[PDB]
Amino acid sequence: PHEYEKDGAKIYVQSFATIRAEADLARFTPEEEVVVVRMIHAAGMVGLENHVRFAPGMAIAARAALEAGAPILCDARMVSEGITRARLPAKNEVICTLQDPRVPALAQEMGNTRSAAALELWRPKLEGAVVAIGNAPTALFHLLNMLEDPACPRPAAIIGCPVGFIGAAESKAALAVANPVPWVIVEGRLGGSAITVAAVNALACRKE
Amino acid sequence: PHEYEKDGAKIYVQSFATIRAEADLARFTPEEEVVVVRMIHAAGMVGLENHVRFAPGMAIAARAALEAGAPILCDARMVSEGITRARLPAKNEVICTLQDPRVPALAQEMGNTRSAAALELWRPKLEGAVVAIGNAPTALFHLLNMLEDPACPRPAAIIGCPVGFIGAAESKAALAVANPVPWVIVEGRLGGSAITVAAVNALACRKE
Numbered sequence: 001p002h003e004y005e006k007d008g009a010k011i012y013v014q015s016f017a018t019i020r021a022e023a024d025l026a027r028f029t030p031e032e033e034v035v036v037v038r039m040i041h042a043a044g045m046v047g048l049e050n051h052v053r054f055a056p057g058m059a060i061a062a063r064a065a066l067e068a069g070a071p072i073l074c075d076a077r078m079v080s081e082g083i084t085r086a087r088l089p090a091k092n093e094v095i096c097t098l099q100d101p102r103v104p105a106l107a108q109e110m111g112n113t114r115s116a117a118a119l120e121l122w123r124p125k126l127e128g129a130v131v132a133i134g135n136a137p138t139a140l141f142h143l144l145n146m147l148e149d150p151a152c153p154r155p156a157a158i159i160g161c162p163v164g165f166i167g168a169a170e171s172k173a174a175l176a177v178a179n180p181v182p183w184v185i186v187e188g189r190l191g192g193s194a195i196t197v198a199a200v201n202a203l204a205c206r207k208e
Numbered sequence: 209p210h211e212y213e214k215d216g217a218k219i220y221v222q223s224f225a226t227i228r229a230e231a232d233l234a235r236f237t238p239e240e241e242v243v244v245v246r247m248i249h250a251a252g253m254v255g256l257e258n259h260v261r262f263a264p265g266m267a268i269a270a271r272a273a274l275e276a277g278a279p280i281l282c283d284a285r286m287v288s289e290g291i292t293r294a295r296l297p298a299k300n301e302v303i304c305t306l307q308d309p310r311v312p313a314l315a316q317e318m319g320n321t322r323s324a325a326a327l328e329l330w331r332p333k334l335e336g337a338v339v340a341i342g343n344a345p346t347a348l349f350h351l352l353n354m355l356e357d358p359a360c361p362r363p364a365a366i367i368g369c370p371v372g373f374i375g376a377a378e379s380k381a382a383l384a385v386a387n388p389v390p391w392v393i394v395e396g397r398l399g400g401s402a403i404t405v406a407a408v409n410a411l412a413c414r415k416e
């Protein structure tokens with residue numbers, strides 16, 4: 001038969017050790033470094049770290065929000081279903097409103113994507129939340145517009161890592177410029193659900 | 209406010225057109241090319257195509273299985289929850305057994321990961337299925353071992369795209385060598401849920 005390593009705890013330890021041996025991680029603070037390592041792990045891509053940018057204090061602020069019970073607001077089910085419930089420190093709600101039955105009509109009325117329209121339903125959970133956007137650039141752009149209204153509840157942190165060729169790089173660059181609340185991005189076209197979930201999972205639990 | 213493109217249908221068309229303008233896709237058959245384009249789209253990574261390998265006729269065989277109602281067996285919820293139900297041609301079941309309450313004890317008895325142990329529960333749905341492994345190399349390795357028994361039901365196709373530093377590259381190289389049923393892999397460390405879902409979504413529906 002095929003031989004392979006079967007101890008999952010060991011696999012993790014070896015994965016992170018390989019990443020730290022290969023990656024260029026010196027510029028990150030200790031709190032940022034843990035997040036970056038998990039993002040690399042999720043992507044299978046040493047070199048990803050050359051594209052990661054954090055607002056000063058974001059990693060600290062996001063961990064603190066999660067430990068205080070902040071909900072995690074997710075743009076897609078691939079993000080929400082990714083989050084490791086066993087790693088959550090304070091029974092944190094993991095929310096994705098994309099499949100709410102009101103979203104298709106709302107999107108049509110708004111002249112926007114379903115991904116973006118769904119964020120309107122985040123309002124009651126948004127104050128102090130950790131936002132995890134791993135897919136839709138239109139969700140990130142729309143969030144920036146929502147937060148231009150001083151009446152809008154404001155999250156504790158935004159993990160802004162949508163992926164793609166159209167609008168993704170722009171949405172993340174705009175997030176960094178706007179600096180609405182502490183943020184992390186992957187600059188450029190790279191990003192996605194797995195990198196986003198890794199960031200959340202890293203910030204949720206002090207144990208790697 | 210921030211200006212951005214909000215027409216999702218248009219965004220797709222532009223994304224695929226950008227990918228085809230930049231990517232090196234000549235060696236793929238028409239059926240393979242559609243799959244590769246969607247994988248690039250999901251990864252935000254022109255250059256991914258340099259790592260993609262198909263068994264001859266896999267893309268044709270997998271589309272045919274799906275159109276015939278084959279279930280899709282998924283190693284993780286980030287894969288199963290990714291699959292676009294609106295794109296499925298024949299009311300195909302999308303299955304992930306990872307969270308079955310019997311898996312933790314089974315994994316312990318088997319001395320294996322939960323990801324791998326869960327595949328034992330695939331047996332009743334495995335014959336003629338499309339397998340979508342986007343995460344766990346141990347799931348792919350274990351599947352290869354399962355299929356070494358002539359009594360094991362055999363899938364119609366395997367999308368073998370686990371990601372990572374430990375065991376991933378090895379598991380996919382082993383799949384290609386073993387050639388148990390028609391396969392697609394991303395060679396090396398790259399892969400993951402998003403690329404895997406993209407492959408399924410591409411093969412499910414003739415419309416991009």
Ligand SMILES: C/C1=C2N=C(/C=C3\N[C@H]([C@@H](C)C4=N[C@H]([C@H](CC(=O)O)[C@@]4(C)CCC(=O)O)[C@]4(C)N=C1[C@@H](CCC(=O)O)[C@]4(C)CC(=O)O)[C@H](CCC(=O)O)C3(C)C)[C@@H](CCC(=O)O)[C@]/2(C)CC(=O)O
Binds near residue numbers: 115134164249250
């Ligand atoms: C499945 C899926 C996937 N998308 C991916 C990536 C991209 N697609 C975007 C556009 C094409 C787009 N995609 C639809 C939007 C549907 C909508 O919101 O109206 C919208 C049409 C619009 C969103 C937007 O552009 O902001 C949604 C969000 N993508 C989904 C569903 C997620 C559903 C859920 O999670 O509950 C979705 C809601 C469609 C659906 O299934 O109903 C991006 C646009 C940028 C670009 O195209 O270059 C980008 C590249 C990010 C891969 C995943 C990436 C990952 O997880 O890491 C992939 C798996 C690829 C695929 O289609 O097979």
Ligand SMILES: C/C1=C2N=C(/C=C3\N[C@H]([C@@H](C)C4=N[C@H]([C@H](CC(=O)O)[C@@]4(C)CCC(=O)O)[C@]4(C)N=C1[C@@H](CCC(=O)O)[C@]4(C)CC(=O)O)[C@H](CCC(=O)O)C3(C)C)[C@@H](CCC(=O)O)[C@]/2(C)CC(=O)O
Binds near residue numbers: 082
């Ligand atoms: C969330 C999550 C994530 N994994 C990723 C990637 C990897 N991790 C592997 C090892 C570390 C591993 N990971 C656990 C296994 C738990 C298990 O099955 O016992 C096992 C421990 C073992 C699986 C295996 O090695 O075959 C599982 C599968 N990963 C999950 C849960 C998926 C649960 C579900 O889907 O229902 C999981 C079941 C743990 C859990 O949450 O309970 C790989 C090993 C190779 C390596 O480490 O370099 C590899 C890199 C692939 C990212 C996703 C990648 C993607 O979607 O594209 C990320 C998001 C990273 C993260 O942990 O934040």
